[PDB]
Amino acid sequence: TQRNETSNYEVDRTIRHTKMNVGDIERLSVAVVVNYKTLAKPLPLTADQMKQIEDLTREAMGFSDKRGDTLNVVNSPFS
Amino acid sequence: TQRNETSNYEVDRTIRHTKMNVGDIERLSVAVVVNYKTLAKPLPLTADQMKQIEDLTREAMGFSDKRGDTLNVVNSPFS
Amino acid sequence: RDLNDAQLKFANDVESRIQRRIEAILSPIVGNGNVHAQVTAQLDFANKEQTEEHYSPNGDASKATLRSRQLNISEQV
Amino acid sequence: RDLNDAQLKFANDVESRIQRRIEAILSPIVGNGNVHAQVTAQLDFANKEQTEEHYSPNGDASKATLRSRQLNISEQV
């Protein structure tokens, strides 16, 4: 038997020439304090309120864990 | 038997030409002192308060242990 | 020096922007003066050129794009 | 000398910034005058050029990108 085969192919392509930006953000670190709520005084915010405040601060951050952004929110009486 | 094979491939690529920045931070070292709380005097801050103060200082640092940043917070009566 | 002060002022500008936005989105809920925020952001300042060049896999013959071919087949018995 | 003083002033500037931020984020909790912070930061000042050139692995034939081929097969019995 025999089988000789010569081929020539053709290739698809892509060329991306990207000149990146000077001055972008690599990581965010946001520390948030909130006061206790005084109504008539020693009342901390509930867990659902702290959770949704964390939600709002995360979304106002532009929070992106690919960049490794860190957010910490605490509640304490002021002075 | 026989099997002769000649091939020619094609290769993907990437070229990154990075001119790094002159003046960036390699390591942070932050030492924090806090006073005792005097209410009516010798009252140190509790462990949860010291822990969340460490949290806030870590997040306000931009603390990144890849760079080997070091933080130490102590509580002591002032003078 | 001047480039360093420009980098520091630009960083402080972005910190002021995000700090003001966090103060504006939270103060209607908890009150006008019951919240503070502090932002520390690491920036890049390295000029980064890049050049990708992808290719598409054409191993399987059902999506190959041939241009020539020279198939010879002999046989004896 | 002047470059050294520029490096020292830039380091002191970054120390002042982080020190002021730590003093601002903690003083509403513990009080106005019950906290001090000190920052010591090591900086780099070496110009660092870099040139990566990655390639993609094409060992397996199902993602190879061929351009030519010359497969000959003989056989006897």
From Swiss-Prot, chains A, B:
Q: Which domain of life is it from?
A: Bacteria
- What is this protein's expression induced by? Inhibited in nutrient-poor medium.
| Subcellular localization, as worded in the UniProt entry | Cell inner membrane; Bacterial flagellum basal body
Where are stretches of biased composition, namely Polar residues? Answer: 1-9
Q: How does it assemble?
A: The basal body constitutes a major portion of the flagellar organelle and consists of four rings (L,P,S, and M) mounted on a central rod. The M ring is integral to the inner membrane of the cell and may be connected to the flagellar rod via the S ring. The S (supramembrane ring) lies just distal to the M ring. The L and P rings lie in the outer membrane and the periplasmic space, respectively.
Which protein family is it in?
Belongs to the FliF family.
Q: What does this protein do?
A: The M ring may be actively involved in energy transduction.
Q: State the name under which the record lists this protein.
A: Flagellar M-ring protein
Organism of origin is Salmonella typhimurium (strain LT2 / SGSC1412 / ATCC 700720)
- Quote the gene name from the UniProt entry: fliF
